[PDB]
Design a protein around this ligand. Structure first.
Ligand SMILES: [Cu+2]
Ligand SMILES: [Cu+2]
Ligand SMILES: [Cu+2]
Ligand SMILES: [Cu+2]
Ligand SMILES: [Cu+2]
Ligand SMILES: [Cu+2]
Ligand SMILES: [Cu+2]
Ligand SMILES: [Cu+2]
Ligand SMILES: [Cu+2]
Ligand SMILES: [Cu+2]
Ligand SMILES: [Cu+2]
Ligand SMILES: [Cu+2]
Ligand SMILES: [Cu+2]
Ligand SMILES: [Cu+2]
Ligand SMILES: [Cu+2]
Lengths: 464, 466
């Protein structure tokens, strides 16, 4: 007579959802098979004073219900003032290490404290699970870190040198981006880059962002020199990592072990496949970009690593795909398809998160707009590189994760920090929305805890 | 062939849940007909220094999807060190804020701290007046309660309470009895305002915990005046109007008050094998006393059936039961006689039974069964016509409040993981009392409400019970 919600959870299998809350200041893991919050943690409790918990990634655990670790970072400073919240008040850029122990979440350490390097945007796990990487776009630094020591393996620092020394034309009329090896300054191999240290801009570029800096609405010490770095993502086949740079519309493919950049991929339609990487000294490389056609954002590899994706955003909205089958040489990576839609012609929507099915035949991609247009999810034919369908969901759509058996896509909507928020679930057989679960959180990220190294091919490792 | 969770919600109705988060420092509204959080707020975002969001009560609105308003308080100080979380801030904000918050159909807005308006900060239960024309808050660290005007946030009246133990050692301070003083608390600053914000007036440094009466007796509760505590909890209202009843955990008595004339009228004695009442004696225009010979159990949960004929006060700890008064004589609460106890062979020291909700017809009540970790907590279903336990169901760690859908169809509760482990929203239907399931809830809720539509709704919301 009465409808039981456990009938709903039962289909989804034995999977743990974890998501950070941005302005809520909490991080929260959820049992998708019973509907319980297994545990949550509020950073304010540990003396954090802008706990804007931002991006996160979970390491594989052979049994998440007994134990899992993940990495979650924060933002602070003037990131507080960006959204709808009439705030009346900490630099953020903390890299917290946290273990769920079968019962509670336990803060283990701040790794930006250990390493000396604080970084505010995407967190990713290595394909080996022996490390993680973070990027930040206020400092324009990404680094891989060791799992065991929380020390930096390599860090890279990026600078824009505009052709036109004015914020309106700084990117459009092109210029030169410098790829620089960033080395420690402090005793014991530590950096002096915690919190604010080394910010070029006093807050992260939000969506629609590149215009705000162009038009001068974004203060800081060096905005003419921003490239806004977002993510360092991983080739699921090892060796390579790719740093995405939002403003000049490029990714750089780094060699992981040899600690060198190897290819610079060009994002927009109307550019070749790659630009031309140019060694200056041992620590320094450059790349010429005659004009920037569009700012890009989302990047990621298919889980077999045959395919490599960048989202152009705003000036163009599409998905750029490269042929990445040659594991051997990323200089040989060539454009193979572009994903466009008639519905992508305007300034919005934008496509800033994704997940693949494990068989590499579909992607699911978020579709973002400011209030009030509702946001949603496009389904991508990842073989034919075609839009299959677009379902509208609601306000402020963020990330997408997928249960590892390929069956459900678990997403977050985060209400611009001030309105409706939720977890949406979508089955992947016929892509019907099964519905929404209460998520009183500002999530800009979400994971299902993975069990295996292979699981990470579709977690927060290969894509953001 | 897939189950849609939308079908779960489609049955629930057009109801809107609100719960505060305690150590999560957040408050959220959930739409029970869709799954969505409608909005959430994070107090830290407003320079709140200890955002332990604590008790809440919501005002009726013709359409809560268009607008509702609520009241939410905070705790600060050594309350932070109470739980399993190894908080690291040693010298936290004082809490005792009283937030007025409006949901405008899109978001939550912090209106004002009513405790800054009035000068009177209070940390425990928050309840709405049944004319919905104000609210009340109580507090067991400073043992004061008070009704506020909804429109000015100024105090209508405030009562301080103080204990004078027969035997002046913390072990015997309540068991060997004593005398409680009820004192009219008048404002001492310009603008009709009190000087009682933050930790001001604290007699002990934390609200006593369930089972806590022992911990204070043993000298384990620090503070200025631990011997002079009564641990006031709540000021709940007769839904017929007229009376507010104040609950005192350590003496095991509730004081009935005339809300319009601002005098106490009765003192109801909680424990089995005490009379109905104890003699309320008048000293002067501002001061009453009552002698309690000996205090045989601490009490906690206190409130009224939706029709006002019954008033309940749960003994907790030394006895565990539900004490029930014949409260039908709305003209004269000196005539309120005990008519029944509720017992259970499986009640006690624990479980501790510290929240309740009635059905709108006043036929059943759902009461919380609380234990420390790891004993499963849950809900007991009571027969309120016969005064018997019908059923108990096991749910999970750290059960807290109960609300009910206004058609009377779904009890909706919260479990709060001790601030550190599992937490959820619980749905249970009232026709045959089955547990329909759980909804993620990442908060340490000590309260939750369903936003009422009418004045009649409130009789089964945060107004009559806590
Ligand atoms: Cu982000
Ligand atoms: Cu310059
Ligand atoms: Cu991003
Ligand atoms: Cu190879
Ligand atoms: Cu967004
Ligand atoms: Cu973000
Ligand atoms: Cu996002
Ligand atoms: Cu209903
Ligand atoms: Cu309480
Ligand atoms: Cu004394
Ligand atoms: Cu209470
Ligand atoms: Cu009357
Ligand atoms: Cu509790
Ligand atoms: Cu409670
Ligand atoms: Cu409480």
């Amino acid at each position: 007579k009465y409808v039981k919600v456990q009938d709903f959870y039962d289909q989804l299998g034995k999977y743990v959802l974890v998501a950070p809350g941005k302005f809520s200041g909490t991080v929260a893991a959820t049992d998708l098979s019973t509907g319980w919050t297994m545990a949550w943690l509020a950073a304010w409790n540990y003396g954090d004073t802008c706990p804007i918990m931002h991006h996160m990634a979970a390491f594989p655990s052979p049994d998440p219900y007994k134990e899992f670790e993940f990495v979650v970072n924060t933002q602070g400073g003037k990131n507080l003032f960006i959204y709808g919240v009439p705030v009346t008040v900490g630099e953020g850029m903390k890299i917290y290490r946290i273990k769920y122990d079968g019962t509670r979440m336990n803060l283990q350490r701040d790794a930006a404290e250990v390493s000396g390097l604080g970084l505010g945007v995407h967190v990713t796990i290595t394909p080996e699970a022996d490390g993680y990487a973070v990027g930040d776009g206020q400092k324009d630094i990404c680094a891989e870190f060791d799992r065991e020591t929380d020390m930096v393996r390599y860090a890279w620092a990026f600078d824009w040198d505009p052709n036109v020394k004015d914020l309106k034309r700084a990117w459009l009329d092109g210029g030169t981006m410098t790829i620089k090896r960033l080395k420690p300054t402090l005793p014991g191999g530590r950096y002096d880059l915690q919190g604010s240290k080394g910010n070029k801009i006093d807050w992260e570029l939000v969506p629609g962002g590149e215009l705000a800096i162009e038009d001068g609405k974004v203060s800081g010490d060096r905005p003419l020199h921003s490239v806004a770095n977002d993510a360092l993502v991983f080739d699921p086949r090892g060796k390579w990592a790719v740093a995405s740079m939002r403003l000049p519309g490029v990714c750089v493919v780094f060699d992981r072990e040899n600690q060198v950049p190897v290819a610079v991929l060009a994002g927009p339609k109307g550019t070749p496949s790659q630009f031309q990487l140019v060694k200056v000294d041992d620590d320094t490389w450059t790349v010429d970009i005659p004009e920037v056609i569009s700012a890009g954002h989302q990047a990621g590899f298919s889980p077999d690593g045959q395919s490599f994706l960048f989202m152009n955003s705003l000036r163009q909205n599409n998905i750029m795909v490269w042929d990445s089958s040659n594991h051997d040489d990323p200089t040989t990576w060539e454009k193979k398809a572009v994903v466009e839609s008639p519905d992508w012609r305007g300034a919005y929507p934008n496509t800033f998160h994704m997940v693949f099915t494990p068989d590499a035949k579909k992607i699911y991609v978020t579709m973002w707009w400011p209030s009030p247009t509702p946001n949603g999810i496009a389904v991508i034919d990842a073989v034919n590189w075609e839009v299959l369908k677009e379902v509208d969901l609601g306000p402020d759509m963020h990330t997408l994760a997928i249960t590892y058996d390929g069956k459900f896509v678990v997403g977050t909507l985060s209400g611009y920090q001030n309105t409706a928020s939720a977890i949406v679930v979508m089955e992947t057989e016929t892509d019907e929305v099964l519905g929404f679960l209460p998520s009183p959180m500002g999530h800009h990220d979400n994971v299902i805890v993975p069990r295996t190294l292979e699981d990470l091919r579709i977690s927060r490792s290969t894509t953001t």
